[PDB]
Ligand binder design. Sequence first.
Ligand SMILES: [Zn+2]
Ligand SMILES: [Zn+2]
Lengths: 513, 215, 69
Amino acid sequence: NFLELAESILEYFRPYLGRIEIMGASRRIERIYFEISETNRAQWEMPQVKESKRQFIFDVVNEGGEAEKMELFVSFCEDTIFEMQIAAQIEVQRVKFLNYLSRNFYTLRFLALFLAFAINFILLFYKVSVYYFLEESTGYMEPALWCLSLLHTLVAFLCIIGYNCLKVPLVIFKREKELARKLEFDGLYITEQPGDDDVKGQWDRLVLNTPSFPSNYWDKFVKRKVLDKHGDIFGRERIAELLGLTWLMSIDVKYQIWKFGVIFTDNSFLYLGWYMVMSLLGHYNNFFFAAHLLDIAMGVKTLRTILSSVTHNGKQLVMTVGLLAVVVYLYTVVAFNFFRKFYNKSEDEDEPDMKCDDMMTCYLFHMYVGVRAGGGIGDEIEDPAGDEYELYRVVFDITFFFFVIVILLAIIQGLIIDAFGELRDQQEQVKEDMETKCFICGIGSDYFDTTPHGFETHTLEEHNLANYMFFLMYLINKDETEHTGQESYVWKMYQERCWDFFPAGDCFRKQYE
Amino acid sequence: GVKTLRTILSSVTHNGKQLVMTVGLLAVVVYLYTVVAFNFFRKFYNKSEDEDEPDMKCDDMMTCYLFHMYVGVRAGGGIGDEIEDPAGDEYELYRVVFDITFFFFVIVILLAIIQGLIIDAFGELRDQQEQVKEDMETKCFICGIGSDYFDTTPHGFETHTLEEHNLANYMFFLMYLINKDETEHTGQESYVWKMYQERCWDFFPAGDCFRKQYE
Amino acid sequence: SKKDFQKAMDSQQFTGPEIQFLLSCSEADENEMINFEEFANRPARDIGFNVAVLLTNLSEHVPHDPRLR
Ligand SMILES: [Zn+2]
Ligand SMILES: [Zn+2]
C-alpha cells in the first residue's frame, strides 16, 4: 500500500535499476542491486553489441555448456565492457576525425563494397581491339573510373586505419586478457612456457618484458602482482627481470612491434590489408581490381552464412576432393595400362592423333574431362567395339561413372547438403536451450513456469544475463574504497577467478518459499 | 490453387533469400572467371564456322560474361566443354586449372548449394511441423504444464486438452462475452471482460490449472 | 651447505626449522656432503596415501564437521 504510492519513482528507475543474484559468502543467494548508467542501458542495445552477444550464446551453447560457461561469460563481458570503453572514447582535429572514421566503419566499408560494384560495372565494358574501354554512355565516365578507382583506394586505405582504431584495440585486449591471466594463474611464462608449437603464445613472450604491457586491460597492477604470487615460488628479482617533441622517442619499441605482430595475425586486418593491396594493384591494372567483389562474401551476412556452410564442413570436403584426385589416379593407372589404345584425339586421321601415352598427361586427361564430363570417362574416348577389352572397358567406365561422379561428386555436393543441416541444428540448439534452460543458473524453464508467466521474468527480472555485465561495469567503474560488502565479495572473488558467485542451481527462488 | 504444390514452392521460398543471394554469388564468381578469361585465356574462345571468317571470339568482355552464363553455368561439364581445347600452349597448364577451379566452384558447389538449400528447406519445414506436433503432444497450449503432470490421472492429458482448456472454448467464451449485454455479465465473466478490455491478459491460466490448484 | 640451504629452500616454501630437520634426514656427511639421493628415502608414501584416503573418507562420509574441515 505504501509502495503503490511510490510507483512514480520505481517506474523511472526501472530501466536502470539492474539486479543480479550471487552466491555471496553466506552460501544463500543474495540479490544485490546496482546503478546502471543510462548510457549503459543504451550502448548495450543498438549496435554490434547485441549481435555480439548473439555470437556469444552461439559460441557457448554450441561449444561450452560446461565449467567454462560461467567463465567464458565474463570473458565475453570483459570484452564487451571494453567495447563500450571504446564508444565512450567515441592534431585535435586528427583524433576527432579518426574517431569519426572509426565509428563510421561499418557504413564506411559498406561504401567500399559499393564502389566495388560501381567500378566493375564499368569494367564490364572493356574489350580488346590492345585493351580498351568503350564509353557509349558519355565520354567523361572513363575518367570517373580513374576517379572512382582513387576514391575506392582512398576508402581502401582509410578503412583499415579505422579498423586499427576500432576492433584492433579489442583484439589487442583479449590477447592481453589471455596473457595477463596466464601469468597471474597458469604461470606459464613463470613456469610451463609454450614450446615451438603454439608459436602465437611464443610470440607473446616478447610483450611481457614491456612496461606498457597492460595497456588495454584496465589493470596496471597485473605485472606488479604476478611477482607477488609467483616470485615467492622460486625467485623474486628474476621475475622482475621478466617484467619490471619527446613524443618521437616516447613510444616503447618491443610492445608496439608485438602489437602489429598480433594485429597481423588477426584475420580481419589481414583481409582488409589484402583488400587494400589489390586496390593498390587496381591502379597498376583494373582487372586485378575485381577481386574486391569477393568482399560481398564478407560484406553481407546473408551470403556469409551460405559460404560459411561450405567451409563449415570443408575439411571433410577438401579431403574428399583430394580423394577424388586419388580415385581418378587409380583409373588412370588402370587406363595407362590395358586400355591405353582407346585414348584418341584423331583429327582427320592418324597424323595429328593425341593418345595420352604420357601418364602424367593421361592423369591430366581424366581430371580435365572424366571428372567433368558428367557422363563419365567414356563419353570422351574411343567407344569400344569388337575388342576383347570391350567387356572390360565398360567395367572401367561404369565403375568410374559411379565411383566418381555418382559417388564422390555426390558426396561433395552432398557434404554441402548436410552442412546446412548441421549449421541449422546448431541454430536450433541455441534457441532450444534458451527456451528451456536459463543460461546462468541452469534450472531451466520448467521450475519457473510454476509461477505465472514466469520464466521470461527470470530471464529478465532476475539473472537476465546482461545485468551481470552491468554489474561488472559497475565494479570496474567504481572505487575500490566505495564498494558495498556484497560487491566487495564479488570483486575479490572476481580477481581470483574463482567464479563461485555466479548462481548455480540455486537462485533467489530456489533458495526461498 | 492446390496446397500440395504450394507447400513445395513455399519450401523453395522458405529459404529462397539465401538462395537468390547464392545465385547472385554465382553470377559474381562467374564474373570473376570471365575477368580471368578476358585476360590470359582470351585467345582460346571461338566459334569458328568453317575457318576464321565467321569466328566469334568473345573479345567484348560483356559478351564474354554473357558467354559464361549462357554456356559455362549451364554446360554441366563446366566452361571447358564449350571452348577450344588447349593442346600445346603453356597456358594449357593453367587453362585446365581455370576449368577445374570453375567446374568445382560453380557447378559442383554453387549449384550444389542451391539444390542443398532446397533440401535443407524440406528438412527445415518438416522439422517445424515436427516441433508443432511435439509441442501439441506435450505441453498444453495454454497453461504450459505439459503432458506429464496430467498423465498421473488415467488417460488424462487428452482430457485436459478437451474437457479443460481445449483452446477453443476460450474462443467460445470470447464469443460469449462479445455476444452478451454488458449488464448481463456474471462477476467472473465481468471480470474477464474487463481485463480483456485492458489487455492485461492475466486471466489465462498460467501454470496453474484447476488440477494444479487442488487435491 | 647446511646454512646456505636454509635460505635456498625458501624457493621450495617449506619452513626452515623443517629444512634443518630435512638436513638431519640427510646423512649430512663431512661439513655438508648432502647427497640428493639420501633424501628420496622419505617408501613412506604408502602411509601418506592411506592418510589421504582416510581423511578423504571422513571428509566425504561426515560432512559439516568444522573440526574435521
Ligand atoms: Zn536463472
Ligand atoms: Zn492446460
